[PDB]
RNA sequence: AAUUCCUUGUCGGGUAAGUUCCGACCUGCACGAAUGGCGUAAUGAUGGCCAGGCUGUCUCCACCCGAGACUCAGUGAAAU
RNA sequence: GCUCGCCGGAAGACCAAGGGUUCCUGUCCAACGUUAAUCGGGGCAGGGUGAGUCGACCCCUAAGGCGAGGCCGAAAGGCGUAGUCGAUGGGAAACAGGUUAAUAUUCCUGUACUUGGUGUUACUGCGAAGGGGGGACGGAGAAGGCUAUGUUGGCCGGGCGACGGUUGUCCCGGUUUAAGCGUGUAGGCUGGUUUUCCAGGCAAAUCCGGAAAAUCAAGGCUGAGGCGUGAUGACGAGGCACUACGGUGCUGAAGCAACAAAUGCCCUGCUUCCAGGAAAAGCCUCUAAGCAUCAGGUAACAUCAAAUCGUACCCCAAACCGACACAGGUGGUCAGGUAGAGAAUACCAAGGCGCUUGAGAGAACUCGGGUGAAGGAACUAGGCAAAAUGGUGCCGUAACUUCGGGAGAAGGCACGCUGAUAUGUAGGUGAGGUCCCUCGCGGAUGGAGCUGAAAUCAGUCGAAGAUACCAGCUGGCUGCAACUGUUUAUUAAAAACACAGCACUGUGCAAACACGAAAGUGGACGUAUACGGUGUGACGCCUGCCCGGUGCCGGGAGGUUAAU
RNA sequence: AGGACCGAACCGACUAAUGUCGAAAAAUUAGCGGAUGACUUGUGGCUGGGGGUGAAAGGCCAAUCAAACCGGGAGAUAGCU
């Protein structure tokens, strides 16, 4: 109903390069 | 964890108070815009 | 006197102190004091105009009489005092008429010495006379650019100028920089050399010593990023550029004097 | 609604 | 070598066994003298290596004390 | 209500900031409270904030803001003088006790104090944005005198006691009193008095400063605490009479001494050090203009005035900042007992709390801990994590070194209790008496009493005496950086950055340079033993050859070369 | 005397574990560094976005930074989904 005002910032655990 | 907002009445009034807005023409336009929108609170009033 | 302190701890190993036993151990003369608010290198716009300035001990301002307009009044040197605003010590002098004043202390002064101003003055150090009456070849300090201006040359500790020639109404002086300048004969000058000649022998020892002297750390251009300084950038200490100022001007041997107004008064330049 | 009188009342320590 | 591809260069020390470490040689791919070279006591929540003590780190786990997990009563979510 | 547990340099009592009725009483349990709820910082209603002395307000000013004219700028506008604002600073004055369900240094009782107006009396020159004094100032360090406060003894009141003993050197409680006024001390500072003169203090001056003499050797200023009065008052353990049984009323003994002792006061002091440590007003003082029968000022008394605003409650938190009744953050003041060097740590007092889901069971497994046979790093990228060391005194202590260090190197020895030396020593404090007194807060003799380490000998208990909490692991070789320090708030604390030192280079003061269309400002109220830029990075040995190329500096023979 | 030593308050964040729809949009527990200084902190000011500030990491500038936030040009443009 209400857009979360905060969006958590994730991380890249797995480079997958 | 110290947060961004640390209230202080003196700093609030001297920064965004009514007389602060009237000092400069840009502040006067800010008041003019908010009068046009019809906002009940023109500024942060003590 | 120069004293080497023992290395009881790091920060004292390289300290060399200059101690003057005859300096006054007490408060200065209050009537001649004035407040000196620091600026931190900021101008009226609030922006940093001079870098590496800020902090330091609070210091008051002593009204030093550079003009020396008390003509014909004998004066006696009460005492010598430490001036935080200057490299050279100042001397509190009492005139015969009951007036006290501050003057730069030449090498020869001591408590009780007699000094005199005006043209009708002796040749001993500390007396101020128009440069026309000063014999050629003598050493003077606190020389005036223009009659009544006050005195601007040879003001640091252990500084002086040489009078080399006198043509017409103008006099030629050799400054401590090796430059010859032509000055009006009406300008006043003080005989002798500025005292505290050992002021250059101090080393300050540690980082804090320069810190509470009002000097802030200096960051090299190479250590910075390309967006901040013309130097900087690259991996592994790459320079590959001609040295320049932070604002692009080429330093390290580029002449920046552009006056064209006072050049008529310059006889030789630095070598 | 708005109160405008945050006057100081310091009780002697 | 904070620099060395070939390379775990060669020899010695240390270990029963040392691609690490320490010492020496120079065949320096591609060190080098204020973008400084070589030493340097003291200092370092700095990198590497070795020794004594110490131990559940481990051979190899065993028991025990508390908080959850489990059951009952009340309240009652979330990603998908 | 009775027990148990927790905090006790706080999880107690106060504020400032910030909240804005959350404060108290009555009443209700829908929602809110991570459960129930009769309860609540929830709902509804009522009540509650009392000042000449507290603070704000007000007088003065710092950084800084605004800024009449003015300078500058296409406009907007920028800067700034005179001025005027701006507390985080300076400036007059109240303490104790009692009382409300909720306010009190504000109300009541008692005893005080400050600044102004008016009036009366006796003297007198008064008079400024002007002069002078004062206000008025750093860091560190040490001793002395003190007090807050604590402990013990004495005194007063009560007790002698459900498990042995306890009328005794035994146990419990109390033993408190302010501001103001008078005295003037420990300590600190300074030589006073009279006369004459002086282009100095943008005018003047009896004031400040300076120069002369005569005179005495003292005077003056500041100053904690103590002592009297305040106070034959208040308070006071406890006892007695009624309780809407929460509490109300009445009564009320002793109220001393010694020792220890602050981070608080004397002290914005004193002694030292280089980095040399606000301003203005209030206040004192001297005069110009002006008036000196006035006005005004001083001294005493009387009277009047001191307005307005804040005053509840939380304030390391459930009430502030974090969306929450959130394991976070938030400046200042008070801060007791035993052991301890200590505001560490353990256990406690005053006081406040058990953190708003509980009851069972006693699986795996996870989290936080305890112990462990034999071995002791065999684990692992790596002794990661754990374990271990840990205090005091004495002995002893290597390489290397800048001679300071390294170093608490490493490594050994003894730590409890009781008695004796000594019916508690050395030491500290110091009553009464005696003699002097430039006579009171005075100086000697004296030791009563109180307090009290450290050490030796002997004895004695335990497996263990730095017995708990608290409390370094150590040594050897080596790379990098000299060192303390700084840095990617929220995966990098380092060899990175800085650094003192060193060198090059620019800059003659309307300085170079920087911010600004400009004015102007910083640099600097400094001026080459100074300032800016650049590289290197303590210290010791040093730092070689190369000017082709690109920069920078100088030259001018000749060639080419814009506007015009 | 000391950018001296050990160590609380205070400031910081080297290691480990827990916690990752957490008590918490970086914390807790046990250790750890500085702790008279280049220290730390309260209150109030000044510097404004191609700008500030920076003991220099492209760090920080209201939980957002190799160019902050808000409104406008604006229904930018998108041979792409």
Residue numbers in the entry:
A (entry chain z): 2 to 18
B (entry chain 2): 1 to 46
C (entry chain C): 1 to 271
D (entry chain x): 4 to 16
Please share excerpts from the published article on this structure.
Proline-rich antimicrobial peptides (PrAMPs) inhibit bacterial protein biosynthesis by binding to the polypeptide exit tunnel (PET) near the peptidyl transferase center. Api137 and Api88 differ only in their C-termini, i.e., a free acid versus an amide, which are negatively charged or neutral, respectively, at physiological conditions. To further interrogate the molecular mechanism of Api88, we incubated purified 50S subunits with Api137 or Api88 and subjected the samples to cryo-EM analysis. In addition, high-resolution cryo-EM reconstructions of purified 50S subunits incubated with Api137 or Api88 confirmed multiple binding sites for both peptides.
